[PDB]
Symmetry: C2
Subunit: 93 residues, 2 copies
């Protein structure tokens, strides 16, 4: 899962490309008090044998991403939005 | 634009991971009767000019892709939808 890490005067913002992932398959947490953990699964659409695959380039499966936040970050004020296959996490400073 | 091409008995289904892309930035055309063409370019995020970029992995650009259909497609029957970062092009056989 490709992620960007930008910083605004107000907060550190994280972005993650998660095409084809429903919000029920993504988990956003804070472990050990200051470690942002973005994880989930990009479910494989196995389907039936009637089908035929001519090309397969898209990946599927589990993904895990961890960033170490500041020992003094609004851990209780972290927001997480998901739209158009892009996840956005806002960690207030 | 990682893409998959599946051939169910009913139609040809193409998938393209285009996270954070808006329909005004993607284009699905048909050339010479049997050539599906997918192209586009994710726009610059009109996000806070001045932000600090700690890490940038998501780095998309222009691209064009073409597939040779097994049979001339009835262009008025071709459906294309964009959702959760995934472009889907269905071609009825």
């Amino acid at each position: 899962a490709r992620m960007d890490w930008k910083e605004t005067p107000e907060a550190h913002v994280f972005k993650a490309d998660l095409p084809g992932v429903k919000k029920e398959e993504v988990k956003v947490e804070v472990e050990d008090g200051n470690v942002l953990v973005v994880s989930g699964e990009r479910t494989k659409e196995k389907e039936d044998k009637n089908d035929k695959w001519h090309r397969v380039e898209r990946s599927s499966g589990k993904f895990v991403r961890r960033f170490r936040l500041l020992e003094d970050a609004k851990v209780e004020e972290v927001k997480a939005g998901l739209e158009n296959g892009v996840l956005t996490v806002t960690v207030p400073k």
